[PDB]
Amino acid sequence: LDRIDRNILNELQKDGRISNVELSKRVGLSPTPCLERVRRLERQGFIQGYTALLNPHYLDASLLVFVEITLNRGAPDVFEQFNTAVQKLEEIQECHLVSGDFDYLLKTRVPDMSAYRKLLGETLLRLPGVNDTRTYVVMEEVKQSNRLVIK
Amino acid sequence: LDRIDRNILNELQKDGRISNVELSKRVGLSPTPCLERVRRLERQGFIQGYTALLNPHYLDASLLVFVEITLNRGAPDVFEQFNTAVQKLEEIQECHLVSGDFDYLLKTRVPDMSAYRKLLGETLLRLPGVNDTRTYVVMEEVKQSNRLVIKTR
Amino acid sequence: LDRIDRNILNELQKDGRISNVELSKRVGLSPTPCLERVRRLERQGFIQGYTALLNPHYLDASLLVFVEITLNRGAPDVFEQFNTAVQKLEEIQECHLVSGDFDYLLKTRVPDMSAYRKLLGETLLRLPGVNDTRTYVVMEEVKQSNRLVIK
Amino acid sequence: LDRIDRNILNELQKDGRISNVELSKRVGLSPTPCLERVRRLERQGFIQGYTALLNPHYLDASLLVFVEITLNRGAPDVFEQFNTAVQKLEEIQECHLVSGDFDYLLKTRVPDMSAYRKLLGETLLRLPGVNDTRTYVVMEEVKQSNRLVIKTR
Amino acid sequence: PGKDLDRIDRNILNELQKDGRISNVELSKRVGLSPTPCLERVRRLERQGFIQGYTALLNPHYLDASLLVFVEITLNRGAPDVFEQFNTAVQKLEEIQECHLVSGDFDYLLKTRVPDMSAYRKLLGETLLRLPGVNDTRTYVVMEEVKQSNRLVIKTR
Amino acid sequence: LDRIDRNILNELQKDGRISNVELSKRVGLSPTPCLERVRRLERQGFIQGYTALLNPHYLDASLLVFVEITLNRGAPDVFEQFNTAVQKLEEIQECHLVSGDFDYLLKTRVPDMSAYRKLLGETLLRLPGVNDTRTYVVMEEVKQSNRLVIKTR
Amino acid sequence: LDRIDRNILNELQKDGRISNVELSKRVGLSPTPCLERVRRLERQGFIQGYTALLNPHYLDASLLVFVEITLNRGAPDVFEQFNTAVQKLEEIQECHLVSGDFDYLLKTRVPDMSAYRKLLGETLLRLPGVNDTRTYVVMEEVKQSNRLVIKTR
Amino acid sequence: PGKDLDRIDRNILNELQKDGRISNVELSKRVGLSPTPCLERVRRLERQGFIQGYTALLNPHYLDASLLVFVEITLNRGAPDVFEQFNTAVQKLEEIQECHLVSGDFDYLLKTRVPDMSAYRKLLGETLLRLPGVNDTRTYVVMEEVKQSNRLVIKTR
């Protein structure tokens, strides 16, 4: 939880394609000193992993859509079971248990407007305990970065 | 739109921090032969870039919250203004313009439940055009991966 | 308004590509007798015209979307002017002045989810007098026939 | 995806009832040379078919009305059932499955305002799954053309 | 252009509604024809259905019913007859003079007349919300009645 | 209030065209006796007058439509203007000023849906300072009686 | 009610920890005199007791959340069960049974948003015959005083 | 794991809330330490902020306030301070003991106490709906109070 590392944190999420060469340079250390420090950050918990970003506008997935799901609270394992079922599906980026008129907010991604339809009713609406599902297609995404705010 | 490149992609996202040789190790290729190919993907538009994923639990953003915002269609630049004004605010991660009741959906991470009350109506409600702002706090984030679905085929 | 013509009406909208050869045959007359009758129906008002149907799933227009528009009643020519402005736009199949929470129901058609966005705010939301616009994209069209019901 | 075929299409829709030669008259082609080409479009999938457009004002369908229907998500076959049950009803023209509040949008033409009250709750409300049905009658239809947008280019 | 409604029967109708107690004799004078021909005339109108009946008008102020209020009933459909069950259930309460099934955000527009506000509050819910399956209700108390005439528009040409 | 009177009113309300010889038989009294009572029952102000009921469907007013009208909150006088200016309009059968999200509620009848579109805007929207105007066509007028509730006890 | 008493209550409500020597100075009377009054003021039942106010933020209860709970309309006894079974739950600060779209309203406090997710479902959803359960986290508790309104006049 | 709250100050707190009039002496006995050390102890707690103050509890039944009702206020945002203007405006009416700004379908959850139903009806609108810009309101009358304790949860370990 050292403060000096915060720089190694921001730059790292800024360009995962930065080896000790440039990573352990812009910071203010040598290719070994803190490069072993950013390594410790990978185990400490900070860095959970690394990944590359892509533009679905290319790979069949140029269509993003959110889905509000409201399932009827029946058996105590209502959510527990749901979560341990929705995760087993990769065609859905996110999913959160919120508070209000609905319970979950899935963020599924698909190619065409036709694809999504097929996703729901076949599996999405086939999830355990679902009762109502309001679909919201995004006509324009103006911001999307899992990057946090490191000072 | 290549074949082997697909596995390349799937591999890079399954693990971004990979060495040149390792990146072309279990893919079915030779070191020098195919490891720089990724550059054409980065030049064209396949690879948008690379980034590290940190745990918001161990950083100053332990709390997450969504918001349904509705912009008042006053001037045609109603949307244009919102967009070119919400980006500057690093407090919010994802921002979308959807169809339906509300118009925008913002996924924001405020360190504390109060911080959000602060973010809201001090830099949030004061956004270019806005009628209502229904907020939905997340009690349990169960899935969160910006990873797409690359399928060999 | 002859009854016997109703058959010539249904078949005609059933296959516009039916010349006197087959059209003036299935009915029960000769290639001349009523073929001159279906001609009269074209002037009488019944037949307004003929057209061919296509599947946008091919030609860039595989994305259909409805838009509820609610404009603030300001000057008496509020609708009059609107209608004499929205018609001058071809990228919109239908448009009706309804009664209720909103005033109009446009049926615009476009290629990608990105196209539509560009349509609105640039022109759609630029229409004279508009104040609120709720967008509804169709994820699945299960029926679409301008065909009426002739008995 | 041809060039001249585009003008062909635009012409056919601008006027379906056209003779073989006339269909290839002002397009920039010769009679026999290009008039049967349309067949490949009809065989492939470009031309869905031809139809005549009659005035609902002079027929027994002078009145038009839209309806926002919401189906209750009970069984996954909730949609499948609605679909394979609304087609059989020739009383309704267009039926769509949209996203948002309600789920379906039906454009129907009932001869008289009463006829609709009849159509509704006698063959309408009794459809496979349904919670609410908000109706919006049309006071003035200003635009109605199934014509698409073919642009030369 | 049909209907073919007698140029004279029209005036008859307009007259009867304008005044529902007019004598046939005077009536026949106001329309021209002899008394007898007018009687079997209004009769054939009162027969067909053009005329549903006659009634007297009372002052909603001289009798406990001064307060007039409108209500909007948006009910939940779930028994393909709900609109019928509801309808054939509001015809039993004289405390409501008009019930209509309109399109839009709500389904029913009711016109109710009660003496007090608390008289309405009573009618509301204790008999109103309890009506055949209904979600919520919007209430609009009349502040002033500028126009109110059940008179139709007979085109006496 | 005289019970026989209250009974006269009721009977009369049920049907006023009835003869005194009949109205007398109902209340159980000689013709003249209460016929002079129904007379004073008028003069006093209990009976605003008599009228016949006509079926709109048979004539020309099958389309009954209620309109919700709101006025500009600017000049306060507008309302008083609106009032004495909306009575003249024959097509407007009833107009009430209520308290709530809107200001007035007009009950109008017309033949064609077009007729309405004509009324609205050519004269309806041109009314003394009008802001909003929401329309509600009726699908079924399940009840319409100006009859009050008199208790014959 | 004695004005001095009503004044004693109020003063006491404002702050009860104050000494009698002080509470006596406020009401303008010798210590003993009304100190015996505040005593009978207790015994009678006007004062349910005394308590200190603690800031939740400082301790561990910065997340205050209200939950709307509905029960199964089956067995009527459930409610009586729910009641005497929900009091034991320390995390549930307040529970009221109201009339409306839902049955109860519980005010609970927890440290982490996780803590809530834990409560809800592990014990909260396991309550005596519960049907629906809508949660409402609070962003700002702008007012919280069990103080009543006593009129010192 | 911080805060570092004295194992003894905790019991102090729990005690003070359990009973707000306890004598310091008795208090010091209940926690162990001598009276004096306990006094400058509760003081440093009453100083920092752990303790906001002391109050007596009155019977909402022996005083006109028997009826308790909850209301849900969903207001319209349009003056980026509306939430502040509203908040700093509900703190002037003692007839409302709890006002919270929660997420979801509505914005405010208020807890109001009035003697009569008509007393509430009065508070409602005449002072309620008139509050700093608010759309509509939902009302929930308490039928029975099963649990009600402002007591927090001090972990005396």
Side-chain angles (χ1 to χ4, degrees), chain A residues 2-3 5-6 9-11 13 16 21-22 26-28 31 33-35 38 41-42 44-46 48-56 58-61 63-72 74-76 79 81-87 89 91-106 108-111 113-116 119 121 123-124 127-142, chain B residues 1-2 4-13 15-16 19-22 24 27-28 31 33-35 38 40-42 45-46 49-52 56 58-61 63-70 72 74-76 79 82-86 89 91-106 108-109 111-116 119-122 124-125 127-133 135-142, chain C residues 2-3 5-6 9-11 13 16 21-22 26-28 31 33-35 38 41-42 44-46 48-56 58-61 63-72 74-76 79 81-87 89 91-106 108-111 113-116 119 121 123-124 127-142, chain D residues 1-2 4-13 15-16 19-22 24 27-28 31 33-35 38 40-42 45-46 49-52 56 58-61 63-70 72 74-76 79 82-86 89 91-106 108-109 111-116 119-122 124-125 127-133 135-142, chain E residues 1-3 5-6 8-51 53-58 60-65 67-76 78-80 82-83 86 89 91 93 95-110 112-120 123-129 131-144 146, chain F residues 1-2 5 9-13 15-22 24 26-35 38 40-42 44-47 49-54 56 58-62 64-71 74-87 89 91-92 94-106 108-116 119-125 127-133 135-139 141-142, chain G residues 1-2 5 9-13 15-22 24 26-35 38 40-42 44-47 49-54 56 58-62 64-71 74-87 89 91-92 94-106 108-116 119-125 127-133 135-139 141-142, chain H residues 1-3 5-6 8-51 53-58 60-65 67-76 78-80 82-83 86 89 91 93 95-110 112-120 123-129 131-144 146:
Chain A
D2 174 51
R3 184 270 92 190
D5 297 310
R6 304 197 73 184
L9 291 175
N10 186 65
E11 295 286 351
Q13 73 181 189
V21 287
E22 196 70 2
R26 294 164 173 279
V27 279
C34 247
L35 178 282
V38 304
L41 273 56
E42 302 179 5
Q44 281 288 181
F46 279 112
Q48 317 198 81
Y50 304 78
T51 170
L53 305 169
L54 306 78
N55 54 177
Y58 285 19
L59 322 184
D60 288 299
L63 203 291
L64 176 58
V65 58
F66 291 101
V67 291
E68 292 170 359
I69 300 178
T70 314
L71 48 78
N72 189 296
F79 313 129
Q81 180 179 298
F82 185 76
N83 299 72
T84 62
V86 60
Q87 294 179 291
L89 318 178
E91 47 200 307
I92 39 184
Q93 295 188 54
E94 291 185 300
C95 175
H96 307 66
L97 179 60
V98 299
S99 49
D101 24 298
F102 60 103
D103 303 310
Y104 296 94
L105 176 55
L106 290 57
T108 179
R109 195 140 201 162
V110 289
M113 182 68 256
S114 309
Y116 170 68
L119 204 176
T123 59
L124 211 55
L127 283 166
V130 63
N131 279 277
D132 190 7
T133 56
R134 279 190 174 182
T135 155
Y136 296 89
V137 292
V138 52
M139 320 174 300
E140 188 186 320
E141 46 189 307
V142 75
Chain B
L1 209 300
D2 288 281
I4 186 65
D5 295 13
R6 297 185 76 117
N7 294 62
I8 296 292
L9 294 165
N10 191 186
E11 287 291 351
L12 272 62
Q13 62 173 174
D15 184 2
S19 181
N20 59 303
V21 56
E22 200 60 8
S24 57
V27 298
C34 193
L35 77 313
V38 307
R40 68 178 295 289
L41 286 71
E42 297 174 292
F46 289 73
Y50 305 78
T51 171
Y58 297 152
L59 286 174
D60 307 303
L63 195 277
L64 173 61
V65 62
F66 283 89
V67 302
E68 288 176 354
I69 300 175
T70 313
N72 189 74
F79 294 61
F82 192 76
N83 295 51
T84 67
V86 62
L89 302 173
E91 283 80 304
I92 61 99
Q93 288 173 54
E94 289 168 283
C95 174
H96 287 49
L97 180 58
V98 297
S99 66
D101 333 311
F102 59 113
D103 296 318
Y104 294 79
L105 169 51
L106 295 67
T108 179
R109 265 193 158 70
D112 188 294
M113 181 62 216
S114 66
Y116 173 62
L119 189 161
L120 176 64
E122 185 188 3
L124 206 56
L125 289 168
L127 277 164
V130 57
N131 290 310
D132 197 4
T133 61
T135 162
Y136 299 89
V137 302
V138 46
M139 308 184 284
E140 181 200 310
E141 52 179 297
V142 58
Chain C
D2 174 51
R3 184 270 92 190
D5 297 310
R6 304 197 73 184
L9 291 175
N10 186 65
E11 295 286 351
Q13 73 181 189
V21 287
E22 196 70 2
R26 294 164 173 279
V27 279
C34 247
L35 178 282
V38 304
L41 273 56
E42 302 179 5
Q44 281 288 181
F46 279 112
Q48 317 198 81
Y50 304 78
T51 170
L53 305 170
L54 306 78
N55 54 177
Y58 285 19
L59 322 184
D60 288 299
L63 203 291
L64 176 58
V65 58
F66 291 101
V67 291
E68 292 170 359
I69 300 178
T70 314
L71 48 78
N72 189 296
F79 313 129
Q81 180 179 298
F82 185 76
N83 299 72
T84 62
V86 60
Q87 294 179 291
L89 318 178
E91 47 200 307
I92 39 184
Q93 295 188 54
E94 291 185 300
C95 175
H96 307 66
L97 179 60
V98 299
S99 49
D101 24 298
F102 60 103
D103 303 310
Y104 296 94
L105 176 55
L106 290 57
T108 179
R109 195 140 201 162
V110 289
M113 182 68 256
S114 309
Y116 170 68
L119 204 176
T123 59
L124 211 55
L127 283 166
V130 63
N131 279 277
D132 190 7
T133 56
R134 279 190 174 182
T135 155
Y136 296 89
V137 292
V138 52
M139 320 174 300
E140 188 186 320
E141 46 189 307
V142 75
Chain D
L1 209 300
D2 288 281
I4 186 65
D5 295 13
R6 297 185 76 117
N7 294 62
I8 296 292
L9 294 165
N10 191 186
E11 287 291 351
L12 272 62
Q13 62 173 174
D15 184 2
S19 181
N20 59 303
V21 56
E22 200 60 8
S24 57
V27 298
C34 193
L35 77 313
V38 307
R40 68 178 295 289
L41 286 71
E42 297 174 292
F46 289 73
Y50 305 78
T51 171
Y58 297 152
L59 286 174
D60 307 303
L63 195 277
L64 173 61
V65 62
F66 283 89
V67 302
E68 288 176 354
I69 300 175
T70 313
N72 189 74
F79 294 61
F82 192 76
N83 295 51
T84 67
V86 62
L89 302 173
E91 283 80 304
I92 61 99
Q93 288 173 54
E94 289 168 283
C95 174
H96 287 49
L97 180 58
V98 297
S99 66
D101 333 311
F102 59 113
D103 296 318
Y104 294 79
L105 169 51
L106 295 67
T108 179
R109 265 193 158 70
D112 188 294
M113 181 62 216
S114 66
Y116 173 62
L119 189 161
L120 176 64
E122 185 188 3
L124 206 56
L125 289 168
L127 277 164
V130 57
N131 290 310
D132 197 4
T133 61
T135 162
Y136 299 89
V137 302
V138 46
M139 308 184 284
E140 181 200 310
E141 52 179 297
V142 58
Chain E
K3 184 199 301 183
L5 211 295
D6 207 314
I8 192 64
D9 295 11
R10 287 196 168 245
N11 295 62
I12 299 289
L13 294 165
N14 192 185
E15 288 289 352
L16 274 61
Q17 64 173 174
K18 208 180 310 172
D19 183 357
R21 288 241 54 168
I22 71 301
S23 54
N24 191 271
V25 50
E26 180 72 12
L27 196 288
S28 63
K29 294 181 180 298
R30 311 278 283 293
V31 287
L33 62 167
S34 166
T36 310
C38 171
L39 189 279
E40 60 84 55
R41 177 91 83 168
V42 51
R43 201 85 82 172
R44 75 155 299 294
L45 271 61
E46 179 184 301
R47 191 181 74 183
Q48 304 288 177
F50 297 71
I51 299 177
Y54 306 76
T55 167
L57 310 174
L58 283 50
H61 290 68
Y62 286 43
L63 309 177
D64 291 308
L67 196 287
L68 159 63
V69 56
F70 279 104
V71 306
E72 281 171 350
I73 304 168
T74 325
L75 49 70
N76 193 124
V82 195
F83 287 51
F86 182 83
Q91 285 151 298
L93 309 82
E95 34 273 287
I96 62 183
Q97 317 184 69
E98 271 176 344
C99 178
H100 299 67
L101 179 65
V102 294
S103 69
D105 38 296
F106 65 101
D107 296 298
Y108 288 101
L109 198 298
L110 274 63
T112 79
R113 239 188 183 69
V114 298
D116 286 288
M117 183 65 236
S118 46
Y120 168 69
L123 197 175
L124 174 59
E126 214 168 66
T127 73
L128 225 43
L129 298 172
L131 280 159
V134 297
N135 297 60
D136 201 3
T137 52
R138 213 63 175 292
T139 170
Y140 297 107
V141 186
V142 180
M143 299 298 230
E144 182 166 296
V146 42
Chain F
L1 254 299
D2 193 305
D5 278 51
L9 294 169
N10 190 179
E11 286 310 276
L12 212 46
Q13 176 185 299
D15 189 298
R17 230 304 175 60
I18 79 301
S19 49
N20 169 221
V21 56
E22 190 73 4
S24 48
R26 296 279 205 296
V27 196
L29 38 76
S30 178
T32 303
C34 247
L35 180 281
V38 303
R40 50 166 288 294
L41 201 59
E42 294 176 284
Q44 184 51 68
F46 282 63
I47 310 181
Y50 306 77
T51 171
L53 308 170
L54 286 55
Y58 286 113
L59 295 178
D60 274 306
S62 53
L64 170 57
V65 56
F66 293 100
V67 304
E68 293 189 352
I69 301 173
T70 313
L71 280 59
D77 280 336
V78 297
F79 290 79
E80 190 263 299
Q81 292 172 51
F82 182 79
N83 296 183
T84 59
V86 70
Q87 314 208 194
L89 302 173
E91 37 273 282
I92 296 182
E94 295 179 0
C95 172
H96 300 78
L97 170 54
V98 310
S99 60
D101 36 293
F102 65 84
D103 296 309
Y104 301 87
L105 176 66
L106 290 59
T108 170
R109 312 185 69 82
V110 297
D112 305 349
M113 178 68 256
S114 307
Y116 178 70
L119 197 182
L120 171 60
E122 191 159 50
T123 160
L124 209 60
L125 276 177
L127 290 166
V130 292
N131 173 56
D132 200 7
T133 304
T135 160
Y136 289 108
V137 304
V138 71
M139 312 194 271
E141 53 182 307
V142 71
Chain G
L1 254 299
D2 193 305
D5 278 51
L9 294 169
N10 190 179
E11 286 310 276
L12 212 46
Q13 176 185 299
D15 189 298
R17 230 304 175 60
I18 79 301
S19 49
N20 169 221
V21 56
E22 190 73 4
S24 48
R26 296 279 205 296
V27 196
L29 38 76
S30 178
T32 303
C34 247
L35 180 281
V38 303
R40 50 166 288 294
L41 201 59
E42 294 176 284
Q44 184 51 68
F46 282 63
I47 310 181
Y50 306 77
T51 171
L53 308 170
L54 286 55
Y58 286 113
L59 295 178
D60 274 306
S62 53
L64 170 57
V65 56
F66 293 100
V67 304
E68 293 189 352
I69 301 173
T70 313
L71 280 59
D77 280 336
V78 297
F79 290 79
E80 190 263 299
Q81 292 172 51
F82 182 79
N83 296 183
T84 59
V86 70
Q87 314 208 194
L89 302 173
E91 37 273 282
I92 296 182
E94 295 179 0
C95 172
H96 300 78
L97 170 54
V98 310
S99 60
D101 36 293
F102 65 84
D103 296 309
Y104 301 87
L105 176 66
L106 290 59
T108 170
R109 312 185 69 82
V110 297
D112 305 349
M113 178 68 256
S114 307
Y116 178 70
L119 197 182
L120 171 60
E122 191 159 50
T123 160
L124 209 60
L125 276 177
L127 290 166
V130 292
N131 173 56
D132 200 7
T133 304
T135 160
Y136 289 108
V137 304
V138 71
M139 312 194 271
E141 53 182 307
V142 71
Chain H
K3 184 199 301 183
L5 211 295
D6 207 314
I8 192 64
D9 295 11
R10 287 196 168 245
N11 295 62
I12 299 289
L13 294 165
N14 192 185
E15 288 289 352
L16 274 61
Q17 64 173 174
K18 208 180 310 172
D19 183 357
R21 288 241 54 168
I22 71 301
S23 54
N24 191 271
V25 50
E26 180 72 12
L27 196 288
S28 63
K29 294 181 180 298
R30 311 278 283 293
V31 287
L33 62 167
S34 166
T36 310
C38 171
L39 189 279
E40 60 84 55
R41 177 91 83 168
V42 51
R43 201 85 82 172
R44 75 155 299 294
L45 271 61
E46 179 184 301
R47 191 181 74 183
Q48 304 288 177
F50 297 71
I51 299 177
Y54 306 76
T55 167
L57 310 174
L58 283 50
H61 290 68
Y62 286 43
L63 309 177
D64 291 308
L67 196 287
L68 159 63
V69 56
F70 279 104
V71 306
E72 281 171 350
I73 304 168
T74 325
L75 49 70
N76 193 124
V82 195
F83 287 51
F86 182 83
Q91 285 151 298
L93 309 82
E95 34 273 287
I96 62 183
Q97 317 184 69
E98 271 176 344
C99 178
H100 299 67
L101 179 65
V102 294
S103 69
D105 38 296
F106 65 101
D107 296 298
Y108 288 101
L109 198 298
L110 274 63
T112 79
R113 239 188 183 69
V114 298
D116 286 288
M117 183 65 236
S118 46
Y120 168 69
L123 197 175
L124 174 59
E126 214 168 66
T127 73
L128 225 43
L129 298 172
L131 280 159
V134 297
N135 297 60
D136 201 3
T137 52
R138 213 63 175 292
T139 170
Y140 297 107
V141 186
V142 180
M143 299 298 230
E144 182 166 296
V146 42

